[PDB]
Write a protein that binds this ligand. Structure first.
Ligand SMILES: CNCc1ccc2c(c1)[C@@H](CC[C@@H](O)CO)[C@H](CNC(=N)N)[C@H]2NC(=O)C(=O)Nc1ccc(Cl)c(F)c1
Ligand SMILES: *[C@@H]1O[C@H](CO)[C@@H](O)[C@H](O)[C@H]1NC(C)=O
Ligand SMILES: *[C@@H]1O[C@H](CO)[C@@H](O)[C@H](O)[C@H]1NC(C)=O
Ligand SMILES: *[C@@H]1O[C@H](CO)[C@@H](O)[C@H](O)[C@H]1NC(C)=O
Ligand SMILES: *[C@@H]1O[C@H](CO)[C@@H](O)[C@H](O)[C@H]1NC(C)=O
Ligand SMILES: *[C@@H]1O[C@H](CO)[C@@H](O)[C@H](O)[C@H]1NC(C)=O
Ligand SMILES: *[C@@H]1O[C@H](CO)[C@@H](O)[C@H](O)[C@H]1NC(C)=O
Length: 335
């Protein structure tokens, strides 16, 4: 166990909050990265018990605390009011590095699921650029699996454990509040989502070989986890995914039961001033949305799912440690 330090390409001049935080908290990214390959060596990794996830989690909590100041912060009767200026918000990649006497082991097995022995290992000083995208159900702006789609879980037999689906080809999602001022929508090409869930059901089919795979909307709970939610240009977008997570995979083929028009799936979205905080139990109140068109163009690189004759998968998420595990699975800090 050691104390990592972050490395970024953040610009001092930029007023975007990730750049400001990284200018005084991270170091400039080394432009001459060194990677040593150890094909003979095999090491044991566990993406679900990784201290780098906890360190990145506290770093992004500090980033959000310094950057996205709410107008009112309510923690069980105690309300803290501050200045809540509208800021420029666009996540930047963050590399995580180990100090001297320590290194970062990197698993190059393109089929690795995060747990067990990895036979082709490498040694690096930092990880790749990881955008700290805080979202539920859909993992946005991440890295894609080089080979086949990968299914990751701490314990697939436990329906309470979050399932991380790592896609090998991205799905473009465009969310926009166009120029009620809290009504927004996302556009997703139904053809790409058809084939994506087609072979996500195939890979899930190998894990549960009867058991026709069925995709359904979140059972219940807080609005942040019952809808695909993400922060776009400093604004909080909550998007209904009932149409998106609506399909049945049976006899090797996928059928989408979600409503679609003109080959595109549209998710109704609402921008909410009142937010249930991911960083800690409590609520944060923010100012009304900025005037003009608020649009985010993102790539869906992963899915967060929960498993309930037939196996049903519903979108989950919330524990933002899982959003970091989807990118930190191939690393392990060793002395
Ligand atoms: C199986 N996992 C179950 C599960 C489910 C939901 C939640 C947890 C666990 C807690 C995780 C805590 C932990 O991580 C400690 O650090 C966390 C506690 N907080 C409150 N109940 N309010 C709580 N998460 C949230 O409610 C939350 O993320 N909302 C939110 C807002 C804005 C955006 Cl954009 C967004 F995408 C999400
Ligand atoms: C991942 O691979 C390990 C090592 O064989 C295995 O024990 C584990 O069950 C696998 N997990 C999943 C979800 O496939
Ligand atoms: C992605 O992975 C799936 C299996 O999970 C495979 O069928 C498909 O051909 C892959 N697509 C690529 C490599 O573009
Ligand atoms: C995983 O879950 C099953 C029950 O769902 C249990 O038998 C096992 O002990 C759990 N933990 C593991 C596999 O380490
Ligand atoms: C999503 O939309 C469906 C119908 O469009 C509705 O029944 C459901 O309550 C909505 N869910 C949320 C979380 O708003
Ligand atoms: C799938 O979407 C349709 C809308 O076309 C909806 O009526 C249905 O209830 C959805 N399936 C669910 C929520 O399981
Ligand atoms: C993903 O990246 C694109 C381009 O950099 C950006 O427009 C979009 O807002 C990002 N998505 C999120 C959720 O930050």
């Amino acid at each position: 166990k050691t104390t990592l330090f972050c490395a970024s390409d953040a610009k001092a001049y930029e007023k975007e909050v990730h750049n400001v935080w990284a200018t005084h908290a991270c170091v400039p990214t080394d432009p001459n990265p060194q990677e040593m390959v150890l094909a003979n060596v095999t090491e044991n990794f566990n993406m679900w018990k990784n201290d780098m996830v906890e360190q990145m989690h506290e770093d992004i909590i500090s980033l959000w605390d310094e950057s996205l100041k709410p107008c009112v912060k309510l923690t069980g009767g105690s309300a803290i009011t501050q200045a809540c200026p509208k800021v420029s918000f666009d996540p930047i990649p963050l590399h995580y590095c180990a100090p001297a006497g320590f290194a970062i082991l990197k698993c190059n097995n393109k089929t690795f699921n995060g747990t067990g022995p990895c036979r082709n290992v490498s040694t690096v000083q930092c990880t790749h650029g990881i955008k700290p995208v805080v979202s539920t159900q859909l993992l946005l702006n991440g890295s894609l699996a080089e080979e086949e789609i990968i299914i990751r879980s701490e314990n697939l037999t436990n329906n309470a454990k979050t399932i991380i689906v790592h896609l090998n080809e991205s799905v473009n999602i465009v969310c926009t509040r166009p120029n009620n001022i809290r009504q927004a929508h996302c556009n997703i090409n139904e053809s790409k989502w058809n084939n994506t869930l087609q072979k996500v059901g195939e890979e899930l089919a190998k894990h549960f070989p009867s058991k026709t795979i069925k995709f359904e909307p979140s059972s219940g709970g807080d609005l942040e986890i019952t809808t695909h939610s993400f922060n776009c240009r400093g604004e909080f977008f909550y998007c209904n995914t009932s149409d998106l997570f609506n399909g049945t995979y049976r006899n090797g083929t996928y059928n989408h039961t979600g409503r679609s028009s003109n080959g595109t799936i549209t998710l109704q979205c609402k921008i909410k001033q009142i937010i249930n905080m991911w960083q800690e139990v409590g609520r944060a109140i923010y100012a009304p949305p900025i005037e003009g068109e608020i649009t985010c163009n993102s790539n869906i690189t992963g899915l967060l799912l929960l498993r309930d004759d037939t196996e049903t998968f519903r979108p989950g998420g919330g524990d933002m440690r899982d959003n970091w595990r989807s990118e930190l699975y191939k690393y392990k800090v060793v002395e």
